[PDB]
Design a binder for this molecule. Sequence first.
Ligand SMILES: Nc1ncnc2c1ncn2[C@@H]1O[C@H](COP(=O)(O)OP(=O)(O)OP(=O)(O)O)[C@@H](O)[C@H]1O
Ligand SMILES: Nc1ncnc2c1ncn2[C@@H]1O[C@H](COP(=O)(O)OP(=O)(O)O)[C@@H](O)[C@H]1O
Ligand SMILES: [Mg+2]
Ligand SMILES: [Mg+2]
Ligand SMILES: [Zn+2]
Lengths: 664, 705, 203
Amino acid sequence: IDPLREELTLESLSNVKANSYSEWITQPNVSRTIARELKSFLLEYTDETGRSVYGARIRTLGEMNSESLEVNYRHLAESKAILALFLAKCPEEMLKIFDLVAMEATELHYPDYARIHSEIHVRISDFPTIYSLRELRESNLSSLVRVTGVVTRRTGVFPQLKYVKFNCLKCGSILGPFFQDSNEEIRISFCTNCKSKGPFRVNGEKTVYRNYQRVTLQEAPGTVPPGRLPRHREVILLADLVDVSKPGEEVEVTGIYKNNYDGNLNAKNGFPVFATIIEANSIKRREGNTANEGEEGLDVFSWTEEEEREFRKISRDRGIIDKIISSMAPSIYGHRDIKTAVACSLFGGVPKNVNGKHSIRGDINVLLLGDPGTAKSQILKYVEKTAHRAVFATGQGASAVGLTASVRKDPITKEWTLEGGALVLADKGVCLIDEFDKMNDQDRTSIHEAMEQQSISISKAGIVTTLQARCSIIAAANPNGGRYNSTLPLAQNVSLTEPILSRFDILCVVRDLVDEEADERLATFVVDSHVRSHPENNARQRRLQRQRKKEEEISPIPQELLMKYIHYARTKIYPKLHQMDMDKVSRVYADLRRESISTGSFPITVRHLESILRIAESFAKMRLSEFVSSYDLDRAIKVVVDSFVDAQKVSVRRQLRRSFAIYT
Amino acid sequence: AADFSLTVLRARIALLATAIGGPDYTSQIDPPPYKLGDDCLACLKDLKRWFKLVDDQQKRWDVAMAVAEYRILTDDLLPILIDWENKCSLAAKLAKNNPDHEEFRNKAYYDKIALNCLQLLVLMTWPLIVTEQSSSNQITLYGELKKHQLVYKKTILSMESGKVLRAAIRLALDVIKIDRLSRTPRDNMVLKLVLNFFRNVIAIEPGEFTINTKKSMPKKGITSIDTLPPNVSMDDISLNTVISSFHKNKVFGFLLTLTSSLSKEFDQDFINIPLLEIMFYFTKDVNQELLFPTSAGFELSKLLQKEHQMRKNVIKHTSARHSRFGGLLSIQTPDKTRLTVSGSQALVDEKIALQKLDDSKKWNKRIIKKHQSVAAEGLPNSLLNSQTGKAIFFTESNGKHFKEFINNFIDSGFNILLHSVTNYFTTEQDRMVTLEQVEYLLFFAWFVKYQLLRSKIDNSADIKQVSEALKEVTFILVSSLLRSAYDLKNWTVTHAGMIAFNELLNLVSRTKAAQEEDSTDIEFIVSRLFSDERIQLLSNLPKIGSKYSLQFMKSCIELTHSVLKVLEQYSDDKTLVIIEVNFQKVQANYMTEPVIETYINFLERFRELEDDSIKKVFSFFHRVFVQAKEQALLFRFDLIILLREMLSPDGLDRMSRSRKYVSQFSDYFLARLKKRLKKSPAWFVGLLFPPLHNSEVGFYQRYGE
Amino acid sequence: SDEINELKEMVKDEHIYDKLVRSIAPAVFGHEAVKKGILLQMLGGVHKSTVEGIKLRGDINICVVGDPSTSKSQFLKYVVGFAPRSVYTSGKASSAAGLTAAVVRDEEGGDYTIEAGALMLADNGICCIDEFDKMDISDQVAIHEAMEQQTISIAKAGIHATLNARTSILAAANPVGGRYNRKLSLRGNLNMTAPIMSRFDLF
DNA sequence: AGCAGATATCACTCAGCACGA
DNA sequence: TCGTGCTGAGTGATATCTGCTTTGGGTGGGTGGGTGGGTTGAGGCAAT
Ligand SMILES: Nc1ncnc2c1ncn2[C@@H]1O[C@H](COP(=O)(O)OP(=O)(O)OP(=O)(O)O)[C@@H](O)[C@H]1O
Ligand SMILES: Nc1ncnc2c1ncn2[C@@H]1O[C@H](COP(=O)(O)OP(=O)(O)O)[C@@H](O)[C@H]1O
Ligand SMILES: [Mg+2]
Ligand SMILES: [Mg+2]
Ligand SMILES: [Zn+2]
């Protein structure tokens, strides 16, 4: 038997006989044992359900033509503790072996996958320990670390030489290709054959290129101590990792802590100090996901095939829309009109492009004009948590170019450049503007183009460009005087102008009135919620079970399942209108215009007919239906008419409600 | 081919290492206990077979490197031995509680595994020697294997406070449990194995820094000479740690028991040489003066004062103003020519001006030094090459333990050990290699000198414990060794014999001081040892000393001093017959230009010597100048320059008796030189040059008449 | 061990609650009502979070109104030097930061940077504001979110962040007129609007 | 033009022996 | 054991050739840095 082909066992693998972990892993027999154990873990691991998680993951990976297999660290730790320890201590060689064993499990399912992607990368999802850029020390060198920060700066994607080939200047012999480290340059000093002190011209008949990118990771403002300067690190993103993190975002970086010799560093400091970097292994978008940190996986909004089947099963239910509405902010007692609007905005409409000449917005904007203590900021926070991409801004905390896009001079290239804003960051998402009425006029006026054209136009310092802002806006405002005056028209209760008001699809007026029954019910619900949330009131499985039991009381649908459902519906569902009552909608629009002719009333234009259609599309989308039904159109008509009626005065509200009773 | 075979060898030895065994983590008891594998004994036997069939017969050392790479020793053999020793200790405690109580199964198998482990330990710890015929592979792996040996020694002395020493002691006591007649050759082999293990543990030490000389050394030069491994410090492998471990594990008691019953209840053939080697390696690097000296604070204050005086003397050479002050001096020669010097001290002083003039010169005359690597001859580092003054810094408790052990050995079995070794070696003289000669001579010299010093300090313990040195068998053995070493031009054995002879002469002088009537039998020895050939040899030694290392010089000097001392004392006391001894003839024999040259050379290095060496040198000079009236010898310029250096304020401390000797000699020498110069102006010229050898004028030069 | 015995002795006292009120700011004379408010603010309330990431405030805000030379400042001074985390400031803040956060850009190349404010610096502590009735317009609007949502949201050129402001505000204000007019209601005597007035737990 | 590294060709020291003294 | 060469290869050493690079300025770059210099004018932004 060839000794190089013999293998040890797991308990013998635990016992280390080398001077270092890397030397132990690199040994032939140990490497074979590790590869065999990793393959066994990938093939045989089962979850609580009992199905192979990684088999389905590999199937999905092959279906989408991707080159990254996500492996949860906890699964490996429970299944194989020693392998998890090796991965934590020696990420490099362990990751190499893991990558090899993954293209043999992918190839197991798709035999000819090598013709699509040559190699497959393994990405670690949930490293148990999280560090700050301040906490990094020398003891973390050459070991896997998990850090969080802000992407301050970014480079363009460059092709980097995977393998470097050298040829002697003198002799002319061409040395074999050598592995290019991501961190620092590879050079040949001593020639095997020539033995020449002289340098080698670097030449190669054929070279394989690799995607390369570098970012400047900075401590997030939230985590840095107040009033202290942030610390930063340089993160290197290799192939398949490029462009995943965009400047200004908050991310969690899983990578290898590496050091290298820097001459200028030494020169400047006067001590033998080594530069440090991070080799990114995995990136998780933490932006707007502070309250979602309790979940697992690189993306909490992604779904599996079984979850898709569950989504279909849920959608087939008749009362899906009612459950979805009831599940919006379960801790808020009532306001079933502010929950319906929020759900409609979250799901959104279908943008349309007629013959390539006419562009129609497909997003829904909502405005909350109400009393001081009617749970508006909490609703905005919930929307931020649930939405896939959300941005939160305050009244005076937002500038006219902090929203939209701004122009700066690039520190490196000394040239004018373009930066994104709130709107940009909220592309295909939601922008939340609390304290809308306290906004500066200038600031307010900025969003006019963005809210309808879904685009940002910039003409500054020789920069002539148009961006994409396909973001919905939900805003909370306080009526003039600090309290709504139901006697006066809507226009006199707020300082907003006709265009901005017209740009809002749904208006939700919130009134605080003293009523014995309403006060009793609201107080009872608030007290019950406060008692429910008291901190005092397997171990992980037990915690999840008790959390699920607590959630079941107030929400018919799990919150995480709800977020996944919303993301799936937005991504994969585009309803269309083919059968609909033209006369009904036309008459509703005409009646709305006739009733809105009154001075000081809520503005009505074609925008609101389009908003009726958009809300019908959104209601159809809530059921994962490919076609808008008559019921959805009726519901949208009822919503719009109810909002319009509620926006009126006390004196004429009864007459308006009696007149419009047919549609509602 | 070779690289692939190396890879296969490493893989197979790694598999063997992983198959030997390891700790059992299943048990909840912590720290976990070591568990033996299914084929532990077979694995050890296979490892020994690999050692025999690859390391030796094929003249390579790849097996040892492979074994060291995978930590077979520090992780498998030492834990196995320690666990077995602990099991035996528990069994002994149980027997104490109840002799019939037993807690052992497969005792034979455990003993077999322990014995094989000890054998493999001895194999791995055996001294490494590089010869001229050693293969390229052996030459290339010398340093790495020496570093691995250092790691092995550190682990042996540290792990569990060194319980493997107790395991080896138990293995030896197992053999001791059976009578001498009942002792089979296997038992004697086990005893020799244990003694060799102890000798190897003591012997190991850092190697040399070998550098290729093909190319003249670069402009960068030598950075540092470090042979230590990464995580090993000199504190772990020093003799202090060895003494601590031996005292803790009662190794000293076992060795004393073996050496006290030597040649009575044991077979001496197996045990005599290992004991001698053990003791030589014990006492090779130890200076006996240190053993007979808070006091540390007092010595620190004295040393600080000494450094303060040195700095004060240095201060006169430093300018009060900064360097760029820019003072220029012009000094007028006896002829009207002006030389330029820079520095405030130049303006304020003249001697400083001439010293700077000298110092500023760029041209250097080549100095060629004949350096011999000790590793070339296979010898270990010892007093022969160790720099003078190199002191082993013992702790108080460790020093007390070492002194007690040496005293007990000298009072118990030094006589018998010396007798047995001398008999065995004189029976087998020709088969001696250089190492054995140096070892025997150094051991004899060290122990004799230590006993002399202790007798001086303490009136109880006396010369009768080392009286076996006087006996003629040992004396003739030493004389033959030294004479043969001289004749064959083996300078290291020459040096060892020199040291041994110096100690023997000091001993005989003390015995004569003891009692004359009882020392008639030693007058016999004195007559025998001062044979004309021997006289000649002893005289020749100094003449050649100048060519070799400093230590050679010092030994030459000391032996000369002892020879003259005994000669003068025994000529004054009585008459001597070898051929009657004419002390004046010998004296005259001692008076030539090479001797003086040697002396001068030795004295040039006066900043490292003690006061005793200077005292001996100047006693010799007094003999030359006054007693012999051979003054022409000393009318040289090397002596004048060196004496200026000695008497200068920066040279020697004012508060010193050495300076007193130097000042007295300088006064006498200057007086006589002035008288001679007043007589003969020619001597001004003469000073510069070696003596003339002309029948006509030679006498005139030499004696002035 | 000795400290534990003292701790158990204190809780064993029947009149413990009264003594703590009387042991707050002993320099001040005859203001037990204000002392009880300060003691409760230091203890605070339990911070709770619902099952969908909605946070419920657990900090107590106190506003003290009084005529000039009534020991209003003395109460703030004692709290500053006693509580673990605390900051002393005034509504008319000198710094460009003010109560809340502000953005400053090193001139040229260097990008916009966040400068901490009074509320930021006192995170997880108590921020004492000497003159609440003189805060800047910017701060007045800005402080809406800090007192309830416990966060500061900024969206300026090239920088956007949410800043933790989990603090308890202990503010001192003067009557809108020269002295407190007993005839008018508390709302009339104060320049504060209805929204801010609701965010204060005690007056 | 000046400076730092390197090659290669230039001597000098200890080495030792034959004659005779 | 001195004197006088003759032999001698080893161990130097010093007299002697082979390749950068520079100033400063974009006729070396922005994966050399901006605390090693240049650097006044226009432009956009926030606090005011
Ligand atoms: N009840 C009191 N007990 C002790 N000292 C008091 C009391 N009331 C007022 N003082 C004294 O009033 C002096 C001035 O009052 P303080 O500095 O506390 O602020 P204030 O004048 O009340 O407030 P502001 O600066 O807002 O007008 C303090 O030095 C304090 O000694
Ligand atoms: N309908 C409601 N159901 C449950 N809690 C409510 C309701 N209305 C108000 N609250 C509570 O009162 C507080 C209202 O503060 P908030 O809504 O942030 O102020 P604003 O309405 O000015 O944004 C919240 O902490 C919330 O818990
Ligand atoms: Mg609000
Ligand atoms: Mg005050
Ligand atoms: Zn080559």
